[PDB]
């Protein structure tokens, strides 16, 4: 390609291979993601006939000024793969690596980060998109600005109000009704994953590893965590889907009051 200068490989795995690059016209930092045609779970269609990974359909749906979801800048089709050109914050670290380095997060830091993830998930749902793989590996932190960005819509779907009976996101974030029945609805399955994520932020590891632990849904804390935060987590991890909070109820909960804005968070917590 002559539109982008390719830099180091940043990582590879079920998401494909992702390289650092720069757009040659204006030096903008980008990430260049290659996904093999044989490993794409779902396909969508652009308004015009072109069959594309679902991920491309979903990223176009979520596009706007709103900075909480990674932007798709361009995409290319090759004979055996698709190449996605995405925004790349610089300096950046994903939340998985951040928690690996710092351990359990201070609650004021977790509250700012969790709030920004809820604003990004609400924006996806308002655009008709369900991510289906919310987890710390799929959240990037713009370290200078304190802003978080959701990435990787490769397991996502268009949002619907009937039941889902397929799933290929991350099993330890997936809800008890998926494990037991292979059936879930989108918003309540999303809120269960948010409960897992909030526990991972304030404890430094996820609460469940085994199917039997997910089904029993009993949460224990190894780290000191305030009673209001443990209430929110246990509410989001209610075993009955209809007992979990809506997004409005999460952002109105007492633990979510008084959030730092992203720049304030970067000044206080980010080196
Ligand atoms: C900047 C960046 C880095 N990565 C990956 C190499 C990870 F760091 C690996 C686990 N978290 C993202 C990315 N992955 C994706 C993706 N999976 O869609 C998108 C971006 Cl922007 C990035």
mmCIF file of C-alpha atoms and ligand atoms in Angstrom:
data_model
loop_
_atom_site.group_PDB
_atom_site.id
_atom_site.type_symbol
_atom_site.label_atom_id
_atom_site.label_comp_id
_atom_site.label_asym_id
_atom_site.label_seq_id
_atom_site.Cartn_x
_atom_site.Cartn_y
_atom_site.Cartn_z
ATOM 1 C CA UNK A 1 0.000 0.000 0.000
ATOM 2 C CA UNK A 2 1.098 3.539 -0.703
ATOM 3 C CA UNK A 3 -1.589 5.273 1.407
ATOM 4 C CA UNK A 4 -0.036 3.948 4.723
ATOM 5 C CA UNK A 5 3.362 3.298 6.032
ATOM 6 C CA UNK A 6 3.297 0.023 8.043
ATOM 7 C CA UNK A 7 5.119 -0.090 11.420
ATOM 8 C CA UNK A 8 5.509 -2.869 14.002
ATOM 9 C CA UNK A 9 3.018 -5.611 14.631
ATOM 10 C CA UNK A 10 1.158 -4.707 17.807
ATOM 11 C CA UNK A 11 -0.400 -8.111 18.339
ATOM 12 C CA UNK A 12 -2.327 -10.992 16.854
ATOM 13 C CA UNK A 13 -4.890 -13.561 17.939
ATOM 14 C CA UNK A 14 -8.572 -14.317 17.299
ATOM 15 C CA UNK A 15 -9.036 -10.741 16.229
ATOM 16 C CA UNK A 16 -6.557 -11.070 13.351
ATOM 17 C CA UNK A 17 -3.185 -9.283 13.051
ATOM 18 C CA UNK A 18 -2.990 -5.557 14.049
ATOM 19 C CA UNK A 19 -0.085 -3.294 12.963
ATOM 20 C CA UNK A 20 0.875 0.233 13.919
ATOM 21 C CA UNK A 21 0.929 2.526 10.840
ATOM 22 C CA UNK A 22 0.813 6.117 9.755
ATOM 23 C CA UNK A 23 -1.370 7.674 7.071
ATOM 24 C CA UNK A 24 1.078 9.172 4.581
ATOM 25 C CA UNK A 25 -1.058 12.186 3.543
ATOM 26 C CA UNK A 26 -1.114 13.749 7.034
ATOM 27 C CA UNK A 27 0.959 11.506 9.378
ATOM 28 C CA UNK A 28 -2.104 10.496 11.306
ATOM 29 C CA UNK A 29 -1.397 7.468 13.562
ATOM 30 C CA UNK A 30 -3.570 4.438 12.556
ATOM 31 C CA UNK A 31 -3.871 0.763 13.408
ATOM 32 C CA UNK A 32 -4.083 -1.613 10.417
ATOM 33 C CA UNK A 33 -6.094 -4.776 11.145
ATOM 34 C CA UNK A 34 -5.957 -7.828 8.791
ATOM 35 C CA UNK A 35 -8.712 -10.444 9.154
ATOM 36 C CA UNK A 36 -8.666 -13.717 7.104
ATOM 37 C CA UNK A 37 -11.846 -14.409 5.067
ATOM 38 C CA UNK A 38 -12.088 -17.975 6.430
ATOM 39 C CA UNK A 39 -12.194 -16.834 10.070
ATOM 40 C CA UNK A 40 -14.915 -14.227 9.800
ATOM 41 C CA UNK A 41 -17.842 -15.488 11.955
ATOM 42 C CA UNK A 42 -20.492 -13.144 10.417
ATOM 43 C CA UNK A 43 -20.991 -11.187 7.220
ATOM 44 C CA UNK A 44 -23.054 -8.202 6.519
ATOM 45 C CA UNK A 45 -23.795 -6.229 3.478
ATOM 46 C CA UNK A 46 -23.217 -2.589 2.650
ATOM 47 C CA UNK A 47 -26.215 -0.577 1.211
ATOM 48 C CA UNK A 48 -25.046 -1.412 -2.353
ATOM 49 C CA UNK A 49 -24.398 -5.179 -2.399
ATOM 50 C CA UNK A 50 -20.850 -5.555 -1.098
ATOM 51 C CA UNK A 51 -20.413 -8.483 1.348
ATOM 52 C CA UNK A 52 -18.119 -7.339 4.193
ATOM 53 C CA UNK A 53 -17.215 -8.610 7.670
ATOM 54 C CA UNK A 54 -20.010 -7.620 10.120
ATOM 55 C CA UNK A 55 -17.404 -5.637 11.898
ATOM 56 C CA UNK A 56 -17.254 -3.172 9.008
ATOM 57 C CA UNK A 57 -21.115 -2.773 9.034
ATOM 58 C CA UNK A 58 -21.144 -2.184 12.780
ATOM 59 C CA UNK A 59 -18.262 0.379 12.824
ATOM 60 C CA UNK A 60 -19.925 2.403 10.124
ATOM 61 C CA UNK A 61 -23.124 2.468 12.148
ATOM 62 C CA UNK A 62 -21.428 3.842 15.230
ATOM 63 C CA UNK A 63 -19.671 6.777 13.386
ATOM 64 C CA UNK A 64 -19.899 10.294 14.616
ATOM 65 C CA UNK A 65 -18.059 12.986 16.584
ATOM 66 C CA UNK A 66 -18.343 10.819 19.674
ATOM 67 C CA UNK A 67 -14.916 9.762 20.661
ATOM 68 C CA UNK A 68 -15.798 6.612 22.840
ATOM 69 C CA UNK A 69 -15.705 4.048 20.074
ATOM 70 C CA UNK A 70 -12.651 3.456 17.813
ATOM 71 C CA UNK A 71 -13.308 5.054 14.416
ATOM 72 C CA UNK A 72 -13.075 3.061 11.119
ATOM 73 C CA UNK A 73 -11.185 5.337 8.727
ATOM 74 C CA UNK A 74 -11.139 3.035 5.627
ATOM 75 C CA UNK A 75 -11.181 -0.646 4.636
ATOM 76 C CA UNK A 76 -9.793 -2.707 1.731
ATOM 77 C CA UNK A 77 -10.609 -6.068 0.332
ATOM 78 C CA UNK A 78 -7.854 -8.467 -0.773
ATOM 79 C CA UNK A 79 -8.214 -11.894 -2.305
ATOM 80 C CA UNK A 80 -8.034 -13.813 1.074
ATOM 81 C CA UNK A 81 -8.536 -11.116 3.703
ATOM 82 C CA UNK A 82 -10.001 -7.706 4.561
ATOM 83 C CA UNK A 83 -7.820 -4.864 5.907
ATOM 84 C CA UNK A 84 -9.378 -2.352 8.285
ATOM 85 C CA UNK A 85 -7.714 1.024 8.950
ATOM 86 C CA UNK A 86 -8.641 2.212 12.448
ATOM 87 C CA UNK A 87 -7.780 5.127 14.676
ATOM 88 C CA UNK A 88 -4.774 4.724 16.952
ATOM 89 C CA UNK A 89 -4.433 6.868 20.089
ATOM 90 C CA UNK A 90 -0.764 7.674 20.929
ATOM 91 C CA UNK A 91 0.461 7.006 23.652
ATOM 92 C CA UNK A 92 -2.055 4.125 24.236
ATOM 93 C CA UNK A 93 -2.370 1.036 26.460
ATOM 94 C CA UNK A 94 -5.256 -1.433 26.592
ATOM 95 C CA UNK A 95 -7.015 -1.840 29.908
ATOM 96 C CA UNK A 96 -5.865 -5.439 30.257
ATOM 97 C CA UNK A 97 -2.209 -4.378 30.207
ATOM 98 C CA UNK A 98 -2.957 -1.397 32.413
ATOM 99 C CA UNK A 99 -4.557 -3.620 35.144
ATOM 100 C CA UNK A 100 -1.674 -6.127 34.720
ATOM 101 C CA UNK A 101 0.770 -3.390 35.535
ATOM 102 C CA UNK A 102 -1.053 -1.443 38.273
ATOM 103 C CA UNK A 103 -3.128 -4.160 39.841
ATOM 104 C CA UNK A 104 -6.653 -3.418 41.212
ATOM 105 C CA UNK A 105 -7.672 0.177 40.374
ATOM 106 C CA UNK A 106 -8.477 2.883 42.940
ATOM 107 C CA UNK A 107 -12.290 3.306 42.990
ATOM 108 C CA UNK A 108 -12.184 6.981 41.705
ATOM 109 C CA UNK A 109 -10.179 5.693 38.686
ATOM 110 C CA UNK A 110 -12.457 2.671 38.135
ATOM 111 C CA UNK A 111 -15.545 4.972 38.354
ATOM 112 C CA UNK A 112 -14.168 7.345 35.625
ATOM 113 C CA UNK A 113 -13.252 4.414 33.382
ATOM 114 C CA UNK A 114 -16.455 2.443 33.941
ATOM 115 C CA UNK A 115 -18.557 5.594 33.296
ATOM 116 C CA UNK A 116 -16.851 6.172 30.023
ATOM 117 C CA UNK A 117 -17.410 2.532 28.996
ATOM 118 C CA UNK A 118 -21.138 2.886 29.790
ATOM 119 C CA UNK A 119 -21.348 6.110 27.615
ATOM 120 C CA UNK A 120 -19.672 4.146 24.746
ATOM 121 C CA UNK A 121 -21.960 1.100 25.069
ATOM 122 C CA UNK A 122 -24.987 3.443 25.186
ATOM 123 C CA UNK A 123 -23.816 5.065 22.037
ATOM 124 C CA UNK A 124 -23.444 1.646 20.302
ATOM 125 C CA UNK A 125 -26.959 0.637 21.405
ATOM 126 C CA UNK A 126 -28.412 3.887 20.249
ATOM 127 C CA UNK A 127 -26.866 3.277 16.876
ATOM 128 C CA UNK A 128 -28.428 -0.243 16.772
ATOM 129 C CA UNK A 129 -25.171 -2.151 17.517
ATOM 130 C CA UNK A 130 -24.446 -4.747 20.250
ATOM 131 C CA UNK A 131 -20.703 -5.323 20.822
ATOM 132 C CA UNK A 132 -21.028 -8.728 22.550
ATOM 133 C CA UNK A 133 -17.363 -8.835 23.704
ATOM 134 C CA UNK A 134 -16.967 -6.042 26.263
ATOM 135 C CA UNK A 135 -13.792 -6.865 28.280
ATOM 136 C CA UNK A 136 -10.590 -5.152 29.344
ATOM 137 C CA UNK A 137 -8.644 -6.406 26.250
ATOM 138 C CA UNK A 138 -11.209 -4.569 24.060
ATOM 139 C CA UNK A 139 -10.854 -1.126 25.786
ATOM 140 C CA UNK A 140 -7.941 1.177 24.831
ATOM 141 C CA UNK A 141 -6.869 4.103 27.100
ATOM 142 C CA UNK A 142 -5.612 7.332 25.443
ATOM 143 C CA UNK A 143 -3.041 7.930 28.156
ATOM 144 C CA UNK A 144 -2.594 11.768 27.552
ATOM 145 C CA UNK A 145 -6.330 12.535 27.589
ATOM 146 C CA UNK A 146 -7.758 9.909 30.005
ATOM 147 C CA UNK A 147 -10.259 8.842 27.302
ATOM 148 C CA UNK A 148 -11.238 5.198 26.828
ATOM 149 C CA UNK A 149 -12.257 3.725 23.348
ATOM 150 C CA UNK A 150 -14.084 0.453 22.718
ATOM 151 C CA UNK A 151 -12.488 -1.758 19.965
ATOM 152 C CA UNK A 152 -13.119 -4.999 18.177
ATOM 153 C CA UNK A 153 -16.712 -5.399 16.873
ATOM 154 C CA UNK A 154 -15.823 -8.734 15.259
ATOM 155 C CA UNK A 155 -18.170 -10.670 17.626
ATOM 156 C CA UNK A 156 -20.910 -7.997 17.548
ATOM 157 C CA UNK A 157 -24.416 -7.982 15.944
ATOM 158 C CA UNK A 158 -27.126 -5.628 15.016
ATOM 159 C CA UNK A 159 -29.206 -5.009 18.220
ATOM 160 C CA UNK A 160 -32.627 -6.634 18.189
ATOM 161 C CA UNK A 161 -35.362 -7.179 20.826
ATOM 162 C CA UNK A 162 -35.773 -10.946 20.267
ATOM 163 C CA UNK A 163 -33.501 -13.699 21.617
ATOM 164 C CA UNK A 164 -29.929 -14.396 20.499
ATOM 165 C CA UNK A 165 -28.927 -18.027 20.242
ATOM 166 C CA UNK A 166 -25.385 -17.645 18.859
ATOM 167 C CA UNK A 167 -22.389 -16.270 20.638
ATOM 168 C CA UNK A 168 -18.666 -16.126 19.946
ATOM 169 C CA UNK A 169 -17.451 -13.524 22.362
ATOM 170 C CA UNK A 170 -15.421 -14.388 25.492
ATOM 171 C CA UNK A 171 -16.947 -17.154 27.541
ATOM 172 C CA UNK A 172 -15.822 -15.882 31.066
ATOM 173 C CA UNK A 173 -17.741 -12.616 30.373
ATOM 174 C CA UNK A 174 -20.825 -14.443 29.060
ATOM 175 C CA UNK A 175 -23.978 -14.748 31.234
ATOM 176 C CA UNK A 176 -25.494 -17.725 33.048
ATOM 177 C CA UNK A 177 -28.426 -17.932 30.606
ATOM 178 C CA UNK A 178 -25.953 -18.368 27.720
ATOM 179 C CA UNK A 179 -24.043 -21.098 29.588
ATOM 180 C CA UNK A 180 -27.215 -22.951 30.666
ATOM 181 C CA UNK A 181 -29.645 -22.343 27.740
ATOM 182 C CA UNK A 182 -27.660 -20.923 24.814
ATOM 183 C CA UNK A 183 -30.196 -18.014 24.879
ATOM 184 C CA UNK A 184 -29.757 -14.355 25.971
ATOM 185 C CA UNK A 185 -31.106 -10.895 25.182
ATOM 186 C CA UNK A 186 -28.737 -8.144 24.173
ATOM 187 C CA UNK A 187 -28.963 -5.439 26.861
ATOM 188 C CA UNK A 188 -29.049 -7.783 29.859
ATOM 189 C CA UNK A 189 -26.136 -9.876 28.488
ATOM 190 C CA UNK A 190 -24.254 -6.549 28.013
ATOM 191 C CA UNK A 191 -24.937 -5.538 31.608
ATOM 192 C CA UNK A 192 -23.680 -8.912 32.926
ATOM 193 C CA UNK A 193 -20.392 -8.321 31.006
ATOM 194 C CA UNK A 194 -20.226 -4.818 32.550
ATOM 195 C CA UNK A 195 -20.497 -6.412 35.971
ATOM 196 C CA UNK A 196 -17.547 -8.686 35.123
ATOM 197 C CA UNK A 197 -15.606 -5.699 33.873
ATOM 198 C CA UNK A 198 -16.285 -3.574 36.982
ATOM 199 C CA UNK A 199 -15.183 -6.456 39.231
ATOM 200 C CA UNK A 200 -12.019 -6.838 37.108
ATOM 201 C CA UNK A 201 -11.258 -3.077 37.451
ATOM 202 C CA UNK A 202 -11.595 -2.952 41.235
ATOM 203 C CA UNK A 203 -10.218 -6.429 42.080
ATOM 204 C CA UNK A 204 -7.555 -6.789 39.327
ATOM 205 C CA UNK A 205 -8.961 -10.138 37.967
ATOM 206 C CA UNK A 206 -12.312 -11.493 36.760
ATOM 207 C CA UNK A 207 -14.626 -13.102 39.355
ATOM 208 C CA UNK A 208 -15.418 -16.443 37.536
ATOM 209 C CA UNK A 209 -13.277 -18.935 35.618
ATOM 210 C CA UNK A 210 -15.532 -21.994 35.399
ATOM 211 C CA UNK A 211 -19.041 -22.549 34.012
ATOM 212 C CA UNK A 212 -20.241 -23.768 37.439
ATOM 213 C CA UNK A 213 -19.069 -20.429 39.089
ATOM 214 C CA UNK A 214 -20.888 -18.351 36.446
ATOM 215 C CA UNK A 215 -24.139 -20.331 36.998
ATOM 216 C CA UNK A 216 -23.964 -20.002 40.751
ATOM 217 C CA UNK A 217 -23.237 -16.226 40.364
ATOM 218 C CA UNK A 218 -21.757 -15.820 43.908
ATOM 219 C CA UNK A 219 -19.195 -13.034 43.964
ATOM 220 C CA UNK A 220 -16.398 -12.892 46.637
ATOM 221 C CA UNK A 221 -13.929 -9.966 47.041
ATOM 222 C CA UNK A 222 -10.247 -10.530 47.697
ATOM 223 C CA UNK A 223 -9.603 -6.753 47.794
ATOM 224 C CA UNK A 224 -11.215 -3.998 49.884
ATOM 225 C CA UNK A 225 -14.058 -2.584 47.732
ATOM 226 C CA UNK A 226 -16.727 -0.197 49.108
ATOM 227 C CA UNK A 227 -20.181 -1.473 49.887
ATOM 228 C CA UNK A 228 -21.764 0.765 47.194
ATOM 229 C CA UNK A 229 -19.404 -0.609 44.524
ATOM 230 C CA UNK A 230 -19.985 -4.263 45.608
ATOM 231 C CA UNK A 231 -23.791 -3.589 45.432
ATOM 232 C CA UNK A 232 -23.534 -2.265 41.846
ATOM 233 C CA UNK A 233 -21.429 -5.278 40.815
ATOM 234 C CA UNK A 234 -23.766 -7.775 42.353
ATOM 235 C CA UNK A 235 -26.772 -6.013 40.726
ATOM 236 C CA UNK A 236 -25.215 -6.226 37.286
ATOM 237 C CA UNK A 237 -24.431 -9.935 37.960
ATOM 238 C CA UNK A 238 -28.012 -10.786 38.994
ATOM 239 C CA UNK A 239 -28.671 -14.400 37.867
ATOM 240 C CA UNK A 240 -32.173 -13.536 36.408
ATOM 241 C CA UNK A 241 -31.673 -11.216 33.360
ATOM 242 C CA UNK A 242 -34.658 -9.087 34.296
ATOM 243 C CA UNK A 243 -33.229 -8.359 37.767
ATOM 244 C CA UNK A 244 -30.137 -6.583 36.251
ATOM 245 C CA UNK A 245 -30.109 -2.807 35.988
ATOM 246 C CA UNK A 246 -30.696 -0.802 32.853
ATOM 247 C CA UNK A 247 -27.957 1.515 31.696
ATOM 248 C CA UNK A 248 -29.859 4.421 33.245
ATOM 249 C CA UNK A 249 -30.052 2.571 36.590
ATOM 250 C CA UNK A 250 -26.288 1.862 36.502
ATOM 251 C CA UNK A 251 -25.421 5.606 35.804
ATOM 252 C CA UNK A 252 -27.923 6.677 38.532
ATOM 253 C CA UNK A 253 -26.501 4.317 41.160
ATOM 254 C CA UNK A 254 -24.882 5.982 44.235
ATOM 255 C CA UNK A 255 -21.458 4.599 43.329
ATOM 256 C CA UNK A 256 -21.554 6.382 39.980
ATOM 257 C CA UNK A 257 -22.063 9.887 41.436
ATOM 258 C CA UNK A 258 -19.391 12.606 41.247
ATOM 259 C CA UNK A 259 -17.325 11.107 38.266
ATOM 260 C CA UNK A 260 -14.078 12.765 37.145
ATOM 261 C CA UNK A 261 -14.024 13.956 33.570
ATOM 262 C CA UNK A 262 -11.371 12.166 31.345
ATOM 263 C CA UNK A 263 -8.694 15.007 31.436
ATOM 264 C CA UNK A 264 -9.020 15.324 35.278
ATOM 265 C CA UNK A 265 -8.598 11.519 35.448
ATOM 266 C CA UNK A 266 -5.409 11.665 33.302
ATOM 267 C CA UNK A 267 -3.933 14.473 35.454
ATOM 268 C CA UNK A 268 -4.605 12.634 38.779
ATOM 269 C CA UNK A 269 -3.983 9.016 37.751
ATOM 270 C CA UNK A 270 -2.166 8.697 34.491
ATOM 271 C CA UNK A 271 1.506 9.000 35.139
HETATM 272 C C1 LIG B 1 -4.143 -0.343 18.908
HETATM 273 C C2 LIG B 1 -4.648 -1.713 18.931
HETATM 274 C C3 LIG B 1 -3.931 -2.690 19.526
HETATM 275 N N1 LIG B 1 -4.668 -3.726 19.333
HETATM 276 C C4 LIG B 1 -4.385 -5.076 19.786
HETATM 277 C C5 LIG B 1 -2.884 -5.531 19.304
HETATM 278 C C6 LIG B 1 -4.493 -5.273 21.295
HETATM 279 F F1 LIG B 1 -3.542 -4.568 21.984
HETATM 280 C C7 LIG B 1 -4.424 -6.675 21.731
HETATM 281 C C8 LIG B 1 -5.453 -6.862 22.951
HETATM 282 N N2 LIG B 1 -6.033 -5.490 23.043
HETATM 283 C C9 LIG B 1 -5.864 -4.822 21.739
HETATM 284 C C10 LIG B 1 -5.857 -3.410 18.626
HETATM 285 N N3 LIG B 1 -6.881 -4.342 18.329
HETATM 286 C C11 LIG B 1 -7.981 -3.879 17.634
HETATM 287 C C12 LIG B 1 -8.995 -4.834 17.374
HETATM 288 N N4 LIG B 1 -8.910 -6.040 17.997
HETATM 289 O O1 LIG B 1 -10.030 -4.592 16.683
HETATM 290 C C13 LIG B 1 -7.999 -2.525 17.307
HETATM 291 C C14 LIG B 1 -6.920 -1.628 17.695
HETATM 292 CL CL1 LIG B 1 -7.103 0.083 17.272
HETATM 293 C C15 LIG B 1 -5.869 -2.148 18.386
#
